[PDB]
């Protein structure tokens, strides 16, 4: 843990003090991580989406920019983990909603089959697809794609 | 022998349309 | 025993599903090898492969056996990789039809479609929505057509009539613990649902193609030449030849109507020659042996359609010289008109129909690219508006209105929960359940909403 | 290297005329129409080979007494008694015949085949030298546009 | 030439209105504005 040049002296001594060291100087790192990273991931993702919401809904605020300067150290870990959708919520209000994106989904989305299916969808929707039912068929494509992604993931 | 019987057997089916 | 064999058959099926395309290409290469070693046959009424120093006769038999085995593997891997998707689409369409149109309630299907009549014995089974990631469709249609029709008249043909009665009865203090007996699941599995699923599979075209493939592979053992029919898979299968074959299959109707018009024009020329040209069709051999004349309408028509079209120079090069009087000019006109109308401006049409398809497909591709590079797929605002901030449009299409992001959001809503949604999530979920899609940004965005 | 070999044989200087195409850019407007697709042309000739092979195996299994290119009479050779020989005969004569393959074989006047072989020959014509050379020409005509 | 004529007819029918001839972009500010304008306000069937 000290050869990777990531943990400083304080971080190294802290992670050494938080070891089990139950009289034998052996640690079950399996349970160690499953205890000290499993809820930390969730809470860190919540903090990251909170900070992203604040940054995108309150720009030109240096008092918050200076805080983002020190928060980017954890905000970058959750970069390929949070999405952003612009929906129509309240009457005439474009609301930006956030959510979590599973690594399994962001893995099976880049398969060549899914990409070729998306390409063919865009092709035959721009060519002969209508306008009144564009979203009607886009949601159908999304459902078919997520079903086939679930199928490819459960195998 | 099917060079001449083929067209006749093909037209033999349209008797059901000729009768109606 | 049962568990240790189920956990193995599931792994085998998962392997066959993971290796569907690989086995496909391997079967293609085996067919190529078979057809390459088929180039060493001779006749003696007896077809014999005596062309090498052995090691070619038994390898053909073992390779045919291997091809049949791999075709069976492909047809059983399709059933595990692609059939779930098509049955998912079928169940989705029929459930949404039931819910939003009342097909089997108020809008009984006609006889001009077999799907509407075959999807009737699936709405009344127990496990109707097997792959639609929800089971609350029967409840929705019951609540929608509950008072306006018979409350029991709906459940009678939607099933679960006696099931719902027994459930309402067992809601009281009457509930036993169901037992599970091994080797006795044939009564538990649904047979009518499997009837419907097998019917959908056998109506699927992509499965009938593999069925014909395996049939030809089996016949290849009865005769080692039906393996030549497996080379058609390079065209009807993989998409490496679509750029070329699309130029032919794009019009199709135009080509068949062109050959029909060609047949009609040749028939007109045939009847003209039959009524006005007698002493010319005299294809005699060695002299004084007249046959293949125009003394018969059908024979003259076949002669025309078979020789005059392929002659490359009309029909005047396949008949006698028109040196006789009273026809020196009439038959010259006849032959030059046949040339200028049949093999000049009627093959030019067939070639133009192939040449124009290339341009039409290229124009389609260019239009797709232009519509993807000029407007957004979701809001459709325009490139010029977003091109005020340095690299504005690409950031808008990659961060704000990403189709991948919207797909991931739908997946998250579907697979997260029902009672754990937030306010916006519950709003979007309700709109998605009633299938309205007013939450998609129609002509506005977060940048047009503010400064 | 070719210029040096031109001394060992005064004919390798003909290979230097390829420089008018692979060198200067005065012929790019024409050669680009050919080298633009390239893959499409080679896949077209591959599909042509496959179609000719299918026609060859059909003729080999169903047409025996027709491939009889005898000279002066009573000298039968160049028949279809061999798969490779029949395939080469097809690919070499039926493609370049300009009128399909029915003009290079015997008249199909025998019974039980009068109609089957007429269909065979007209389909070969309409599929090999009508809509498979039209593809090769369309691939060159579309590149200009 | 015939294909280009057909495509031009389709483009002129999908981009402008037959009667007023204003444009698609102006009516495409209200969600599904142009199709409602061409089906309710300026319908050729209605004028006939
Ligand atoms: Zn957009
Ligand atoms: Zn108008």
PDB file of N, CA and C in Angstrom, chain C residues 259 262-263 266 301-310, chain D residues 55 99-103 108 115-131:
ATOM      1  N   UNK C 259     -39.024  -7.784 -66.161  1.00  0.00           N
ATOM      2  CA  UNK C 259     -38.972  -9.044 -66.898  1.00  0.00           C
ATOM      3  C   UNK C 259     -40.359  -9.425 -67.411  1.00  0.00           C
ATOM      4  N   UNK C 262     -40.768  -7.409 -70.496  1.00  0.00           N
ATOM      5  CA  UNK C 262     -39.933  -8.028 -71.518  1.00  0.00           C
ATOM      6  C   UNK C 262     -40.622  -9.245 -72.120  1.00  0.00           C
ATOM      7  N   UNK C 263     -41.237 -10.078 -71.277  1.00  0.00           N
ATOM      8  CA  UNK C 263     -41.976 -11.229 -71.784  1.00  0.00           C
ATOM      9  C   UNK C 263     -43.123 -10.792 -72.685  1.00  0.00           C
ATOM     10  N   UNK C 266     -41.700  -9.579 -76.033  1.00  0.00           N
ATOM     11  CA  UNK C 266     -41.260 -10.722 -76.821  1.00  0.00           C
ATOM     12  C   UNK C 266     -42.458 -11.489 -77.362  1.00  0.00           C
ATOM     13  N   UNK C 301     -42.530 -18.904 -79.581  1.00  0.00           N
ATOM     14  CA  UNK C 301     -42.348 -18.052 -78.411  1.00  0.00           C
ATOM     15  C   UNK C 301     -41.149 -18.494 -77.584  1.00  0.00           C
ATOM     16  N   UNK C 302     -40.984 -19.804 -77.393  1.00  0.00           N
ATOM     17  CA  UNK C 302     -39.821 -20.294 -76.662  1.00  0.00           C
ATOM     18  C   UNK C 302     -38.534 -20.006 -77.423  1.00  0.00           C
ATOM     19  N   UNK C 303     -38.544 -20.199 -78.745  1.00  0.00           N
ATOM     20  CA  UNK C 303     -37.372 -19.877 -79.549  1.00  0.00           C
ATOM     21  C   UNK C 303     -36.990 -18.414 -79.386  1.00  0.00           C
ATOM     22  N   UNK C 304     -37.973 -17.518 -79.471  1.00  0.00           N
ATOM     23  CA  UNK C 304     -37.705 -16.101 -79.264  1.00  0.00           C
ATOM     24  C   UNK C 304     -37.104 -15.860 -77.885  1.00  0.00           C
ATOM     25  N   UNK C 305     -37.860 -16.182 -76.830  1.00  0.00           N
ATOM     26  CA  UNK C 305     -37.426 -15.906 -75.463  1.00  0.00           C
ATOM     27  C   UNK C 305     -36.095 -16.557 -75.112  1.00  0.00           C
ATOM     28  N   UNK C 306     -35.693 -17.610 -75.820  1.00  0.00           N
ATOM     29  CA  UNK C 306     -34.481 -18.333 -75.465  1.00  0.00           C
ATOM     30  C   UNK C 306     -33.277 -17.965 -76.316  1.00  0.00           C
ATOM     31  N   UNK C 307     -33.474 -17.520 -77.553  1.00  0.00           N
ATOM     32  CA  UNK C 307     -32.377 -17.243 -78.468  1.00  0.00           C
ATOM     33  C   UNK C 307     -32.264 -15.754 -78.776  1.00  0.00           C
ATOM     34  N   UNK C 308     -33.386 -15.100 -79.084  1.00  0.00           N
ATOM     35  CA  UNK C 308     -33.320 -13.711 -79.501  1.00  0.00           C
ATOM     36  C   UNK C 308     -32.914 -12.771 -78.388  1.00  0.00           C
ATOM     37  N   UNK C 309     -33.212 -13.132 -77.140  1.00  0.00           N
ATOM     38  CA  UNK C 309     -32.843 -12.280 -76.015  1.00  0.00           C
ATOM     39  C   UNK C 309     -31.353 -12.400 -75.725  1.00  0.00           C
ATOM     40  N   UNK C 310     -30.825 -13.620 -75.765  1.00  0.00           N
ATOM     41  CA  UNK C 310     -29.429 -13.874 -75.440  1.00  0.00           C
ATOM     42  C   UNK C 310     -28.503 -13.774 -76.643  1.00  0.00           C
TER      43      UNK C 310
ATOM     44  N   UNK D  55     -24.475 -23.186 -60.209  1.00  0.00           N
ATOM     45  CA  UNK D  55     -24.914 -23.608 -61.535  1.00  0.00           C
ATOM     46  C   UNK D  55     -24.100 -24.800 -62.025  1.00  0.00           C
ATOM     47  N   UNK D  99     -24.002 -14.438 -74.107  1.00  0.00           N
ATOM     48  CA  UNK D  99     -25.389 -14.836 -74.214  1.00  0.00           C
ATOM     49  C   UNK D  99     -25.738 -15.947 -73.248  1.00  0.00           C
ATOM     50  N   UNK D 100     -25.116 -15.931 -72.073  1.00  0.00           N
ATOM     51  CA  UNK D 100     -25.339 -16.974 -71.094  1.00  0.00           C
ATOM     52  C   UNK D 100     -24.485 -18.192 -71.365  1.00  0.00           C
ATOM     53  N   UNK D 101     -25.073 -19.378 -71.230  1.00  0.00           N
ATOM     54  CA  UNK D 101     -24.374 -20.625 -71.517  1.00  0.00           C
ATOM     55  C   UNK D 101     -25.095 -21.480 -72.548  1.00  0.00           C
ATOM     56  N   UNK D 102     -26.327 -21.135 -72.924  1.00  0.00           N
ATOM     57  CA  UNK D 102     -27.097 -21.910 -73.880  1.00  0.00           C
ATOM     58  C   UNK D 102     -26.603 -21.874 -75.301  1.00  0.00           C
ATOM     59  N   UNK D 103     -25.686 -20.971 -75.622  1.00  0.00           N
ATOM     60  CA  UNK D 103     -25.112 -20.878 -76.954  1.00  0.00           C
ATOM     61  C   UNK D 103     -23.807 -21.648 -77.082  1.00  0.00           C
ATOM     62  N   UNK D 108     -31.094 -28.174 -76.467  1.00  0.00           N
ATOM     63  CA  UNK D 108     -31.821 -28.995 -75.490  1.00  0.00           C
ATOM     64  C   UNK D 108     -33.124 -29.556 -76.051  1.00  0.00           C
ATOM     65  N   UNK D 115     -37.767 -28.242 -71.169  1.00  0.00           N
ATOM     66  CA  UNK D 115     -38.168 -27.081 -70.385  1.00  0.00           C
ATOM     67  C   UNK D 115     -37.213 -26.827 -69.223  1.00  0.00           C
ATOM     68  N   UNK D 116     -36.717 -27.891 -68.585  1.00  0.00           N
ATOM     69  CA  UNK D 116     -35.826 -27.716 -67.443  1.00  0.00           C
ATOM     70  C   UNK D 116     -34.537 -27.020 -67.854  1.00  0.00           C
ATOM     71  N   UNK D 117     -33.961 -27.415 -68.991  1.00  0.00           N
ATOM     72  CA  UNK D 117     -32.709 -26.802 -69.411  1.00  0.00           C
ATOM     73  C   UNK D 117     -32.910 -25.420 -70.017  1.00  0.00           C
ATOM     74  N   UNK D 118     -34.068 -25.153 -70.620  1.00  0.00           N
ATOM     75  CA  UNK D 118     -34.373 -23.789 -71.038  1.00  0.00           C
ATOM     76  C   UNK D 118     -34.445 -22.871 -69.825  1.00  0.00           C
ATOM     77  N   UNK D 119     -35.118 -23.326 -68.766  1.00  0.00           N
ATOM     78  CA  UNK D 119     -35.165 -22.554 -67.527  1.00  0.00           C
ATOM     79  C   UNK D 119     -33.764 -22.347 -66.973  1.00  0.00           C
ATOM     80  N   UNK D 120     -32.966 -23.418 -66.934  1.00  0.00           N
ATOM     81  CA  UNK D 120     -31.597 -23.331 -66.435  1.00  0.00           C
ATOM     82  C   UNK D 120     -30.820 -22.260 -67.175  1.00  0.00           C
ATOM     83  N   UNK D 121     -30.867 -22.301 -68.504  1.00  0.00           N
ATOM     84  CA  UNK D 121     -30.023 -21.409 -69.288  1.00  0.00           C
ATOM     85  C   UNK D 121     -30.509 -19.968 -69.200  1.00  0.00           C
ATOM     86  N   UNK D 122     -31.829 -19.755 -69.215  1.00  0.00           N
ATOM     87  CA  UNK D 122     -32.330 -18.387 -69.118  1.00  0.00           C
ATOM     88  C   UNK D 122     -32.083 -17.813 -67.725  1.00  0.00           C
ATOM     89  N   UNK D 123     -32.102 -18.649 -66.679  1.00  0.00           N
ATOM     90  CA  UNK D 123     -31.796 -18.152 -65.340  1.00  0.00           C
ATOM     91  C   UNK D 123     -30.321 -17.808 -65.209  1.00  0.00           C
ATOM     92  N   UNK D 124     -29.445 -18.645 -65.769  1.00  0.00           N
ATOM     93  CA  UNK D 124     -28.024 -18.317 -65.799  1.00  0.00           C
ATOM     94  C   UNK D 124     -27.795 -16.982 -66.492  1.00  0.00           C
ATOM     95  N   UNK D 125     -28.459 -16.774 -67.632  1.00  0.00           N
ATOM     96  CA  UNK D 125     -28.312 -15.516 -68.358  1.00  0.00           C
ATOM     97  C   UNK D 125     -28.787 -14.337 -67.519  1.00  0.00           C
ATOM     98  N   UNK D 126     -29.989 -14.437 -66.948  1.00  0.00           N
ATOM     99  CA  UNK D 126     -30.563 -13.307 -66.225  1.00  0.00           C
ATOM    100  C   UNK D 126     -29.894 -13.060 -64.879  1.00  0.00           C
ATOM    101  N   UNK D 127     -29.137 -14.023 -64.351  1.00  0.00           N
ATOM    102  CA  UNK D 127     -28.538 -13.853 -63.035  1.00  0.00           C
ATOM    103  C   UNK D 127     -27.031 -13.642 -63.055  1.00  0.00           C
ATOM    104  N   UNK D 128     -26.340 -14.004 -64.130  1.00  0.00           N
ATOM    105  CA  UNK D 128     -24.884 -13.963 -64.174  1.00  0.00           C
ATOM    106  C   UNK D 128     -24.378 -12.816 -65.042  1.00  0.00           C
ATOM    107  N   UNK D 129     -24.919 -12.670 -66.249  1.00  0.00           N
ATOM    108  CA  UNK D 129     -24.416 -11.678 -67.190  1.00  0.00           C
ATOM    109  C   UNK D 129     -25.396 -10.528 -67.390  1.00  0.00           C
ATOM    110  N   UNK D 130     -26.469 -10.467 -66.601  1.00  0.00           N
ATOM    111  CA  UNK D 130     -27.455  -9.398 -66.691  1.00  0.00           C
ATOM    112  C   UNK D 130     -27.505  -8.573 -65.411  1.00  0.00           C
ATOM    113  N   UNK D 131     -27.669  -9.231 -64.264  1.00  0.00           N
ATOM    114  CA  UNK D 131     -27.760  -8.538 -62.984  1.00  0.00           C
ATOM    115  C   UNK D 131     -26.544  -8.765 -62.107  1.00  0.00           C
TER     116      UNK D 131
END
